[PDB]
């Protein structure tokens, strides 16, 4: 759909769309940029993630509102709440499938540097996690395992190739710990991962510049916030 627009123009317009809080547009511009077939830079990977994370984040929040109403309804309100929750759920699944399709065709296979490959595998884990949040049928276990497998591959690369304060490594561990707690029914694994990640980052802060320290400590605080909620 964006096939006739220049890559550089799509990137520029994604940045404008973020400033205007037009995240659906942002995501469409970044989908068009990925489909040009070239690898993405660090900055461009962040534009792609910001765009889709915000779109699906809004869908998730709406699905949760509707699912809560539906559960309370289960006086007969008729089929409308279930129908509308199903409509939002199908849209959410469609966006997740789109993101997963971009990662599979062909972002992951072309990503050789640890920073890019971990970034994309963390995204893959996240979008299977979002699918798992709404899954109920025969594929629910397989969707959960697909998230797990992507996060695990990202973890294995991150532990070999990045320092324990690297912000991508930290964000990956944060999100995988959320997976363990909220999806996999493994709260002890979630707590252990968050604690070990936090403590190993703390011990490496002394190596960092002021700007790297700020980024690592920001994500450490998120780990700590979850640990406070979970313990």
């Amino acid at each position: 759909a964006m096939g006739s627009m220049e890559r550089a123009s799509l990137i520029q317009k994604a940045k404008l769309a973020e400033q205007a809080e037009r995240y659906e547009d942002m995501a469409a511009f970044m989908k068009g940029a990925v489909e040009k077939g070239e690898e993405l830079s660090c900055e461009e990977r962040n534009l792609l993630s910001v765009a889709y994370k915000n779109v699906v984040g809004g869908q998730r929040a709406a699905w949760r509102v509707l699912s809560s109403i539906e559960q309370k309804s289960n006086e007969e309100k008729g089929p409308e709440v279930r129908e509308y929750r199903e409509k939002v759920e199908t849209e959410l699944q469609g966006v997740c499938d789109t993101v997963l399709g971009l990662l599979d065709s062909h972002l992951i296979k072309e990503a050789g540097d640890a920073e890019s490959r971990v970034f994309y595998l963390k995204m893959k884990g996240d979008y299977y996690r979002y699918l798992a949040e709404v899954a109920t049928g025969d594929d629910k276990k397989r969707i959960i395992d697909s998230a797990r497998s992507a996060y695990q591959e990202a973890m294995d690369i991150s532990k070999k190739e990045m320092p324990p304060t690297n912000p991508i490594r930290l964000g990956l561990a944060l999100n995988f710990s959320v997976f363990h707690y909220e999806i996999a029914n493994s709260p002890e694994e979630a707590i252990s991962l968050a604690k070990t990640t936090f403590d190993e980052a703390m011990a490496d802060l002394h190596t960092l510049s002021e700007d790297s320290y700020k980024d690592s400590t920001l994500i450490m605080q998120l780990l700590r916030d979850n640990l406070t909620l979970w313990t």
Binding site: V50, D126, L174, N175, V178, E182, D215, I219, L222
Partner: peptide
């Protein structure tokens, strides 16, 4: 609980 945000803010 909380996952990583898209931007630092």
């Amino acid at each position: 609980a909380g996952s990583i945000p898209g931007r630092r803010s």
